[PDB]
Amino acid sequence: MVPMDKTLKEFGADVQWDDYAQLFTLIKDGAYVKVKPGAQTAIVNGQPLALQVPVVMKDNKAWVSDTFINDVFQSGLDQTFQVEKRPHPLNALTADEIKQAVEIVKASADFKPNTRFTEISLLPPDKEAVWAFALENKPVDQPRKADVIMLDGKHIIEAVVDLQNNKLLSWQPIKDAHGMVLLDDFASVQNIINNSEEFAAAVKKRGITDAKKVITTPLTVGYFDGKDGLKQDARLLKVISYLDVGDGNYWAHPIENLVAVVDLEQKKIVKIEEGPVVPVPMTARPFDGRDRVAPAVKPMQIIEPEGKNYTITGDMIHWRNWDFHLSMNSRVGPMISTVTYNDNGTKRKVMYEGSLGGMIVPYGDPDIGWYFKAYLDSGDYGMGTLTSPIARGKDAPSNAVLLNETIADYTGVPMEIPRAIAVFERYAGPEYKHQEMGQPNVSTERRELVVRWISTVGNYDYIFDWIFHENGTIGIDAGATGIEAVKGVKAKTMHDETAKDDTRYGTLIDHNIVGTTHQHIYNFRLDLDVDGENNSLVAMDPVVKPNTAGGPRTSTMQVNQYNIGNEQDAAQKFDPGTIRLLSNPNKENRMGNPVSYQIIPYAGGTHPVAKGAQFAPDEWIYHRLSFMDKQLWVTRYHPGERFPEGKYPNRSTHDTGLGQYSKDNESLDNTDAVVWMTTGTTHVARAEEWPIMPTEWVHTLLKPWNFFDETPTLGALK
Amino acid sequence: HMVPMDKTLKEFGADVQWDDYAQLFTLIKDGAYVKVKPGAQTAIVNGQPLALQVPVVMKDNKAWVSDTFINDVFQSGLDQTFQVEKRPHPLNALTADEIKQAVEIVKASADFKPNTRFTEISLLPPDKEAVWAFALENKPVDQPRKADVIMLDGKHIIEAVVDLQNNKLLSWQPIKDAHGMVLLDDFASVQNIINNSEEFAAAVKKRGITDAKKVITTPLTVGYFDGKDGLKQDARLLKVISYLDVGDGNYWAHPIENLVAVVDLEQKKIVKIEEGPVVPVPMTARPFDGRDRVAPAVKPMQIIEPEGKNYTITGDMIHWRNWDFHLSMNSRVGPMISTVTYNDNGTKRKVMYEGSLGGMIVPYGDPDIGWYFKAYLDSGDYGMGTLTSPIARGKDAPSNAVLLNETIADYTGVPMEIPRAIAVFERYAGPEYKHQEMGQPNVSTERRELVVRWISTVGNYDYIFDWIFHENGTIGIDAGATGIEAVKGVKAKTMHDETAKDDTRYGTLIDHNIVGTTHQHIYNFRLDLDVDGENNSLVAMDPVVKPNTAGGPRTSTMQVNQYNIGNEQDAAQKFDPGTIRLLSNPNKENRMGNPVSYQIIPYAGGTHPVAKGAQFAPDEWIYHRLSFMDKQLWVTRYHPGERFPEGKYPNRSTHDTGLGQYSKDNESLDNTDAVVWMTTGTTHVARAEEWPIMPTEWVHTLLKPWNFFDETPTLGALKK
Ligand SMILES: [Ca+2]
Ligand SMILES: [Ca+2]
Ligand SMILES: [Ca+2]
Ligand SMILES: [Ca+2]
Ligand SMILES: [Cu+2]
Ligand SMILES: [Cu+2]
C-alpha cells in the first residue's frame, strides 16, 4: 500500500476530494475516475470496476494498493487508446529503428569520427501504397527505410538505410550544402566567446564588468554575395550578446553594436564587428512572476466523465467522421497524414499529408547587429527537436490528452518528448441555428478537434493548431508568444534627443529598449487529395456586372470563374474577397458541381497582416526565399519537394524551395497537386508586449465546397 | 409539500445530474453549482453548506423535493453571481413601470390618436458627462429620467419626449416624410391581405399551387428607386415574397418564384402584383430540425465552475477582473455596452462610453422581380432587439454561461420580457502568454475572455454578436451568421440541365431547383471610445519599406510613416489590414512617453469571403442612400443624436441620413471627443454544405490597447 496522493500526482493524474460526497475524482488524459473510500468498486469513464483492495483512509490520508494505478487506469475501461496490431506505413521511426539506422551508417568504412545527425527520419513507401493501406487495408509489402542525414564537421552527407534487411542503400555527399544549427553549436559559441581575450576586451569597452555574465546567441548569417565580408566555404554563425543580471531574462539586457563571427570548424572568432557604444539596459525585467502575485481565481474545469469521442490507435486518430494519422518530425514537427472524411459509410480522401512547410522571421533594421537576422526556425534550428512540452491545463484546456513523441537527437540517440502534442475537443459556439418565429428553436453545438503543438526557438514560442471541424472544415492557426528581440538605445522616453533615430526601425517599448520591427511568415505544405488524386485549381472572382436582365438595377453580383493551369499562375497573392478552390474535375456532388475544397490562406489575425515581404526585390533574403511574397502556391506532387525555403537554407545563394519547385511552370490540370499556404504578420511592438508577449494569432482555413450534397452535420437519415 | 424533483427542476431550467455510484445529485443553473444527496440535511451551493429542513427524497427510484426547494437553494445567497444595486445606474434601461408610465403620458396627450403604435420606447440619454461622473465619481446625475417615445400614427412618425420623474409630456413632434419601421402586426396584415386577395389566389393557382391556404408570405421593405420601381414615395408599402408550406417545417425551401405582391399597409390591400415566368415550386421535403435524421450518440462534455463565477452582476453593472461596464437592451440595435473602464492598479481608466451595433445591411445581387429590391436593414427596419432569440442553454452558449433576461416595450406599448436574451460566460482561450526558455522551468499562463453574446433572428437569418473582453485590455467584437438561406426557384436540377448556366448567373445551385442567391452581410459597429479621456485624435501608422541609407549590405529597411487624420472626411476610409490605425489621447502618455492609445481593427478575419465594399455599381440607389457600406473605418465627433450608420428612418429613404450625413460637414477630429464606426462584412456565394441549414460563419473585429499600458497587462501585482 502507498499514499494515494503522492502516487497519483507522481503518475501525472489530477486528484480531487469532495468531503461532502466522500468521493475522490481522479483525472488523467482520457481517464475520468471516481472512487469512494472503503468502496468495493470504482467508476472509470462511466463504467463500474471491481476493486481487489478498496481505497483506504488513514489519519485522513488516502491509501491504495501498489497495483491501483495499473488496475484502474490501465484496466481497459478507458478506451481513449487502442492497440495497433497492423502498424501504419507512415509511423515515425521508433527508438529501436533510430538506433538501428545509426549502427548501419557507423558500420560503413566512410563514417567519419565525430559525425553528427541533422535528421534521421522515415523514408516512406510511395503515396499510392500508403493510401491503399489506409483505404483498403492493403499491406505495403515494403521494408522500413530511413533517411540519415549527417554532418561531418561541416559537410553534409545523405544516406539511406534498409532497416529490415539492415543494410546501407546509399551514401551521398551533398556538395556546397551547409548544415543546420545543432545543439552543440550553441555551447561552442559560448565557450569560444568565453575564451577570447579580444572579445572580452570589446565587452570591457561597452561597460561590462564581469565578462562571465555575458550570454551569447548563435545566429545564422545568411548570404550577401560577399557584402558581409564572409566566405561561403566556412561554416559560420554570428553572435549577439546579452548581459545576465539575474532577473531570468537576459533578453532584456542587450549589448548593442557588438557582433562576433564564429567559425565552428576553426573553433574561433574570425571577425568582431564594433559599432557605437550603447550602455546596457540594466533594470531587472523578470517574466516568470518572481516579483508578482497573481490575483485569486475561481476554478474552471472542462470535463468528459465518460471518456473521449476520439480513439487513438497507435498514431491513428479517429473522431466522428474524421480519420487521420499523426506523427512527429525533428525539423517541421507534427505531420497529419491520410486524412479522410467518412461520408455516410464511405471514406473520402481529403489530404494525404499536411504539415508546417517552413517559416521565417526577418527583421527590418540595417545596423550591424540586425541587418542579417532572418531566422528560418524550422530549417535552421529544428522545430520538432525544439518542441516545448505542453503545460497541462494552461498551454491546452484541462480536457486535453497529451501525447509523447519520439525523435532522434543530433548524436543519433532516441529522444522522447513528453507531452509533445495536445489533442482536445472543444465547444465552438452553435454549429448552426434557426429560431423560426413562433416555432420551436433549432440549435446544434459545434465541436472541433484540436491538435496543438508548441515549439520554442531562442526567444520565440510558436503554437500550431490543426483544427478539424465536424462539418468537414479544417483550420490551421499559428500563435506567437515569447520574448521580443530588442535593441539597446540611449533614449528612455520619446522625449529624448535620440528617441527619433532610436525608434526609426522599431517602437520604444521600455526605457532604452526598442522592439525592432519584423515579420512572422508561416508556410504550410498541404498535399490535398480532394476526393481523389487528380485535381485542378479553379478561381472564382466575385464581380460586379452591369444588369442586362432589365428592371431598376444597373448592376448585378456575378462570378468570374476560370482555371489556373500552371505552377507560375498558381503562385499568387491572395485576395480574401475572392475564392480559390482545389477541385476534382472527375467527381461531382448531387447538383453536378465538381467536389472541391476552398483554400483560404488568410482568415484573420490579431497583428497587422503581412501583405508580402517587407523587403525590396533586390534584397538577398528576398531572392533566396520566394515563398515569402506569395500567399498561395500550387505545385505538382513530388516526394522530394517539401520545404518552402529549400532543403538546405543555411547560407543559401538562391531559392531551392518553392521558387525552384514552380520554376518549370508545369501543368496543374487534372493532376496530383500540392497546396502551399503562406501567411504572416508585420510586427510593430507595444509596451503591452514587454517583458513577455501576449499570444498573437493568425488563421487559415480549408472549407469543403460542394464536396457534400447538403449540411454535413444534419446526420444520417432514418 | 413535496414535488417530483426532476420535473420541477427541468421546468425551472436547471440541469439535473444523478450519480448512482456516489448517490449524489448535481444541479446546475447559471452561476449556481449545487450538490445534494438523498436524505441529507445539508446541500452544497458553490462550495458552501446549506441546511435543508426537508431533504431530497428517493421514493421508488423517484426523487422528491419540497415545494420550497428551488427557492431555498437557488435563491439562498450562497450564489453571489447577482448582487443588488444600491444606487440606480443612470443608463439603466426603462423599467416595465416606466414603459407603462411613458405610454400613459402620451395617451393622455391632446393629440394622441387611437391605434397609435410604438416603434420605439427608450430611455433618453442623460448628459454623457454626468454619466461618467457617476460611474467614476459616484456623483448623482440629477436630471429627470426622460424617455423617447417614437410612435407610428398609421404611417406617420411622431416623436414624443416624456419626463418620467415629473410625469410630464415634454414634446410632441411629427416627423415629415419619414417612414416607420416594420412592426409585428404588419406581418399578420400581409398574410391576411394575401389570403383575402381574389387575384393573388388566382395568380398562385396558375403557378401550380392547388391550396392557397398553404401559401406563406414574407414582408419585405421595398427601398427606393426614384420612382423607377413604379411605387409612390408617399404610401406605406411592403413587397411580398411567398413560399409553399409542404409540412417539412421549412417553407423557405419551397419558393414561388417570379411572383411579387405590393401591399399598401394603410389601405389594407394589394396595390400591385408583379408576375414573371412560371417556375415549378421545389416540392421535396427539406426539414432542418432533424425529424428525418438519426440522432448519433455523443459523450458528454461540461464546462464547470464549482465555486461560482469570477464576475459579479450588480443590477446591470458587470464587474470582472479589471473590467467594469454597464449592459442594457435596446429594441432596435440590441445590447449596449456602456461606461467601460479598465482598473489600472487602483485607477479606473476610461475605455469606451458606449458601444453597440450601429446597424447592418444584407444586399442581394439578382436583378429579377423577386430580388432586385432586396437590401435589408435588419435592425433599423425590423428591430433586432425586439427580434432577440432566447439563448438555447448549452447549445447557443457554453454550459458554464449565465443567461440574462431583458425587458423592452412591444409595438403596443406593453412591457416585454425576453427570456435568456443575453449570455455571459467566461472562457478558456489558450495560453495568454508563454516562454519556455531552454533548460529552464516553463513560464505559462492561461488566457481568459469574458464573452457577452446576443442572438437576433430576422425572418430566415440568425445573427450572433459576441462582445469579447480580454483580460489583457483587448476587446473583440465578432459577428456570426446562420439560419436558412433565401433561395430562388429554378428549373435546373443539376448543372447539366439546359437552363443551369442562366439559373446560376446570380448564385450557386445548392439543391435541385434551388439557388442560393448571392448577397452580402455588412455589419457596422458604433463605438464611442474614450481612450483614457474624452479628447482624442486619430493617428495613422503605415508600415513601409524604405531604402537603406544607414549603410551595410541591406538595400532596404522596414519603417513607419506616421501622421494624424485631421477630420471626418479623411477618417472615412477603407481599411488596409497591413496598416495601423490608432485612437490616441494626445494629452496622456505611458511610461515611455508614448500617447496612450487603442488600435482599431475593422478587419481581423472571417470564415466567408470578405466584402471589399458594397457589391453595387456606383450608379445604384441602395448605394446612394447608404454610404456606410463602402468604408470600413469612420470617425466622427460625438453627437448624442448620431447613432445609426444607415440613418434613423431608413425605410424608403431618399438620401443618406446616416454616416454620409454625420461626416458631411467634414469636422475636425483633433484632440476632441471621437466616435469610431467599424464596418465589416462578407460576400456570400452559396454551396451545398449550407443547405437546408447554414453552418455558422464568423467575422472578427478587434480593439487593442496600444501603449495604453507600460508593460504586459497580465503580469500580475508587483510585490516590490
Ligand atoms: Ca514542380
Ligand atoms: Ca494532392
Ligand atoms: Ca460631424
Ligand atoms: Ca469618444
Ligand atoms: Cu514578432
Ligand atoms: Cu449569407
Side-chain angles (χ1 to χ4, degrees), chain A residues 471-490:
Chain A
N471 62 206
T473 306
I474 297 173
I476 310 170
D477 293 7
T481 179
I483 311 304
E484 262 189 278
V486 302
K487 173 168 177 175
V489 304
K490 293 214 245 292

Side-chain angles (χ1 to χ4, degrees), chain B residues 128 528-530 673-674:
Chain B
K128 170 179 180 169
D528 180 6
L529 307 179
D530 288 351
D673 188 352

Side-chain angles (χ1 to χ4, degrees), chain A residues 20 34 291 427 554 692 716, chain B residues 19 42 294 395 619 712 720:
Chain A
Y20 175 78
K34 295 179 301 182
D291 54 341
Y427 170 77
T554 73
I692 195 168
Chain B
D19 191 320
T42 294
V294 170
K395 297 176 182 184
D619 57 14
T712 305
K720 319 156 180 177

Side-chain angles (χ1 to χ4, degrees), chain B residues 494-543:
Chain B
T494 77
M495 294 302 295
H496 303 113
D497 294 344
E498 60 179 60
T499 67
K501 191 260 203 155
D502 293 332
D503 289 349
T504 62
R505 186 181 314 299
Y506 311 114
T508 314
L509 180 65
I510 64 183
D511 196 353
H512 302 315
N513 307 98
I514 293 178
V515 166
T517 304
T518 300
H519 51 288
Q520 314 183 83
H521 295 289
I522 300 177
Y523 315 97
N524 181 79
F525 296 102
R526 174 181 183 292
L527 312 163
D528 180 6
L529 307 179
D530 288 351
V531 182
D532 204 11
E534 169 191 359
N535 306 303
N536 311 319
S537 295
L538 184 59
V539 183
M541 293 191 185
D542 298 351

Side-chain angles (χ1 to χ4, degrees), chain A residues 430-434 446 703, chain B residues 360-362 378 384 454-457 460 462-466 478-485 519-523 606-608 681-684 687 690 693-700:
Chain A
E431 167 56 17
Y432 62 61
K433 172 192 183 58
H434 187 51
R446 173 169 297 172
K703 306 179 58 175
Chain B
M360 56 182 290
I361 189 178
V362 182
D378 290 351
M384 297 178 60
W454 170 65
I455 305 182
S456 182
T457 304
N460 63 295
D462 295 274
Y463 297 116
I464 314 175
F465 295 92
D466 290 356
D478 293 11
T482 178
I484 315 302
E485 247 198 298
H519 51 288
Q520 314 183 83
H521 295 289
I522 300 177
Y523 315 97
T607 60
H608 257 167
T682 67
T683 292
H684 188 180
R687 60 197 161 89
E690 302 165 349
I693 187 165
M694 312 182 301
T696 311
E697 300 289 1
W698 296 84
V699 298
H700 330 287

Side-chain angles (χ1 to χ4, degrees), chain B residues 660-692:
Chain B
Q661 175 192 300
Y662 311 151
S663 60
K664 195 56 284 181
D665 278 29
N666 193 192
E667 309 196 67
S668 178
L669 299 174
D670 182 66
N671 195 194
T672 187
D673 188 352
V675 174
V676 174
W677 309 70
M678 300 196 304
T679 298
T680 184
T682 67
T683 292
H684 188 180
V685 180
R687 60 197 161 89
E689 287 72 26
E690 302 165 349
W691 183 259

